[PDB]
């Protein structure tokens, strides 16, 4: 009982409501009543619900139906479960091992012992890893008592692609919130493509093209030339400025991408938005077109996005005869734009959703071939407000060849926070190695291993950092300058700089 | 009162353990063990104890003492602890909060209450993550009863550097890398010698700037020297084994050599400890060691000697071009001694049991992606019962958005089917359902119904769910692959489509 039901998350409430994403065509009909076509699903977050509203026949690019709100009259008990294993659930709550779960949850017998005087019971679960959303499981028979309201119908807006669905989800965050007007982007994209077809210098570059199936390498050099020529045009002004220094946004990457697109798109694929999206979605290098690198979305204005898509479009049109099997170049301006637009929206949605950055909690920090992470969530928390010790474990390894760990930088506080020298150590494939710790200043201590440490494929390390607290005083924000522990990798030189591997921590009671 | 692990606690007659001893104390400590965690440490593994035997003043390159075995007469209680926080240990067991733990552990009140009849109690802790060894903590007063015996004295053997210590630690696995470093040392000199006093090699050794020159130009010349040097008969084996793998290219030997010449000054070259400390923080050493893709390729005395020799000569050439060392004896002196120590450290790590990438919670790093089983239990597929199981996989990537095309899953009719309704993937919390369809009778491929991209700031949790219709246990000879294949981006090699494969290895258990 207490081993599968989370009482703290269980509760009673009058007019319990939740949301249900609905496919195209069922938005008006479901309003007449919740009917079985083993459970009826709903969620507490109307935005997560919108993500289930896409046409099941065209899941990647199809149209989105809508979201409806379902409300149970009277009192409803929400029963939170710690596990989603039915047989396990049954063996604990002393239920009929033979009879289905959601079958018993709808019977009065179950409602009395678990409902707390409520008219019915609805099961609850964590919506997903990395989500604070809740997923509800409703009995079909009890669900028949739900009154249904229209929360929103995406089709009636009359927008293109899945624009309505994504503009809706973007409301959750309205760093920063990416809330782009894709109508304007679609409009600006078309306008720019057009301007870039009938021009002086750009039209000249098109006539200086092989226009025949050629090797990748030759296809790429011409494309880079095209990219450079094209980028000097006034309408790609801003793009030229924002793509000039970050290697990831270089012409060579726009060409690699364009070549790749031409290679995998044939006539049948070009003629279908769903199949095009499928093909493009598994390609590498898309971050170059989206201007997404180093954990941030750099292309976040309608103007710059339309310029990048227009430039990639034009380029794909060029890479087609040189690399593709396709004969109809129309694909570059039609489905390629439609498909890539969708992909942009997916990635933007992802950056808009709360998530831990590398080195925070158990999200690994990947850098220079190394992978480091806090072993457990509690490890990333430095508790305060007490005298005594604590231990914090950090996992460390590398992708291939032996890369060294020179040591670690740890925060200190003259008076309170101190590094416990004897308990701080690092182990390599189980070999325990002690460390030599010395203050580099009042607030930072550097610990170096007393034996050489290397990690790589097949060789991992556990860095165990231990802290000593002299007083029960709480660590205030100002006291600790940095917010991360710095593991140091290899040294590279005319100045010495170490590979910085960061693990971010939180200060709590 | 859950700070003691009774399952691992026991009483034993003549409880013995091992203690690593520093140089000069091997003989003396045998006369007897003498003085919050003031303790006398010992361990159940004499090889791990050998690792604490290195001179405190020169811990990187210094000499090793030896290992001694300590035995308590009569019966002894080994109390296994679940935590190393003394304060917690005091509060839970209901002891005084003001007096030091190890002081209290050696008293009769404690010895009667927890000793289960023993004459004294010894505390026990897990040695460390990735280790199955045990660390013992002894009360100094009680430790006076320990009889001390010699297991091995490393200096008595009279070997060079830390050879005796590493030869001894290598007995544990004696695939085991068990190299004879005397032979390797002797062959290194012989090879360095032949390579300096030769015809063809000295011809290239003459066409040198021999003056502080550009770093790029230093490399170029070194790559040619490497190219030329590698044609000598004494480096024939190395020529062949370093021929195709890019990690072992002359360019890497050059990058390595240049890096060495840049960080060694006369003071450093004159002190092995300082040389090791300087060299131990440089990248690219796997080029010289021949270590890549999870294996030690240079595992014969001959080939190891050639690589070090070749590296020594290159460092000798790199110095004038980039370094400021008026002397060049370093390349043949402390450079060889220090790099030898580093080969030994890395070899020892590959000799120790450890989980490979994609096993247990060790991540699998490849093509910018990083994937791992969420917990150790997730990597275990239980069999021998009708029912469902869930398995969570963490997925992310280093920088730009890379896609996840799907996942290849093993299937066994009745004993292991994919539960299509509960199999899904979440990206920064957005739950995405999957379309699962068999490729063949043994493998099922699940594609996400919404495009999936991971990268810096975007992670995914792939939740694989299995259904078992039969109670019959899955037998070993019934699954072809022991891994779950997560698929990343697709690439067209020439005109052939291949997927970036990310593997999570699982174990079948009852």
TrEMBL record, chain A:
Domain Diphtheria toxin catalytic: from-to ranges: 1-174
GO cellular component: extracellular space
Diphtheria toxin receptor-binding domain mapped to chain residues: 357-508
Signal peptide (UniProt feature, chain positions): none
Annotated InterPro entries: Diphtheria_tox_rcpt-bd_dom_sf (IPR036799), Diphtheria_tox_transloc_sf (IPR036801), Diphtheria_toxin (IPR000512), Diphtheria_toxin_catalytic_dom (IPR022406), Diphtheria_toxin_rcpt-bd_dom (IPR022404)
SS bond list: 173-177, 437-447
Source taxon at top rank: Bacteria
One protein family per Pfam: Diphtheria_R
GO molecular function: NAD+-diphthamide ADP-ribosyltransferase activity; toxin activity
Protein name per its UniProtKB record: Diphtheria toxin
Organism: Corynebacterium diphtheriae
């Amino acid at each position: 009982a207490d081993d599968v039901v989370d009482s703290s998350k269980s509760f009673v409430m009058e007019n319990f409501s939740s949301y249900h994403g609905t496919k195209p065509g069922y938005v008006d009909s479901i309003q007449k009543g919740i009917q079985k076509p083993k459970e009826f699903y709903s969620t507490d977050n109307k935005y997560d619900a919108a993500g289930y509203s896409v046409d099941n026949e065209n899941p990647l690019s199809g149209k989105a139906g809508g979201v409806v709100k379902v409300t149970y009259p009277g009192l409803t008990k929400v029963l939170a479960l710690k596990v989603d294993n039915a047989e396990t659930i049954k063996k604990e709550l002393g239920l009929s091992l033979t009879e289905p779960l959601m079958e018993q949850v709808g019977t009065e017998e179950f409602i009395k012992r678990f409902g707390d005087g409520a008219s019915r019971v609805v099961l609850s679960l964590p919506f997903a890893e990395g989500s604070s959303s809740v997923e509800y499981i409703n009995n079909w028979e009890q669900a028949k008592a739900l009154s249904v309201e229209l929360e929103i119908n995406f089709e009636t807006r009359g927008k293109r692609g899945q624009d309505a669905m994504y503009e809706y989800m973007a409301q959750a965050c309205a760093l920063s919130c990416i809330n782009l007007d894709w109508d304007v982007i679609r409009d600006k994209t078309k306008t720019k493509i057009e301007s870039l077809k009938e021009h002086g210098p750009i039209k000249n570059k098109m006539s200086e093209s092989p226009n025949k199936t050629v090797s990748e390498e030759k296809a790429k050099q011409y494309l880079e030339e095209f990219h450079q020529t094209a980028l000097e045009h006034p309408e790609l002004s801003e793009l030229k400025t924002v793509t000039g220094t970050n290697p990831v946004f270089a012409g060579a990457n726009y060409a690699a991408w364009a070549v790749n697109v031409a290679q995998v798109i044939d006539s049948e694929t070009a003629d279908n938005l769903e199949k095009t999206t499928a093909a493009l979605s598994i390609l590498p290098g898309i971050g170059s077109v989206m201007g997404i690198a180093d954990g941030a979305v750099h292309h976040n204005t309608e103007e710059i996005v339309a310029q990048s898509i227009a430039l990639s479009s034009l380029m794909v049109a060029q890479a087609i005869p040189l690399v593709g099997e396709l004969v109809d170049i129309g694909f570059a301006a039609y489905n390629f734009v439609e498909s890539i637009i969708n992909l942009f929206q997916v990635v933007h949605n992802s950056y808009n959703r709360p998530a831990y950055s590398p080195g925070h909690k158990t999200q690994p920090f990947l850098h220079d071939g190394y992978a480091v992470s806090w072993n457990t969530v509690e490890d990333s928390i430095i508790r305060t407000g007490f005298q005594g010790e604590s231990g914090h474990d950090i996992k460390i390894t590398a992708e291939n060849t032996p890369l060294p760990i020179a040591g670690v930088l740890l925060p200190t506080i003259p008076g309170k926070l101190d590094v416990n020298k004897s308990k701080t150590h690092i182990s390599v494939n189980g070999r325990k190695i002690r460390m030599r710790c010395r203050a580099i200043d009042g607030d930072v201590t550097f610990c170096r291993p007393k034996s050489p440490v290397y990690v790589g494929n097949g060789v991992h390390a556990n860095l165990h950092v231990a802290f000593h607290r002299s007083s029960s005083e709480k660590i205030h924000s100002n006291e600790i300058s940095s917010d991360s522990i710095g593991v140091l990798g290899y040294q590279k030189t005319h100045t010495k700089v170490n590979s910085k591997l960061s693990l971010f921590f939180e200060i709590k009671s």
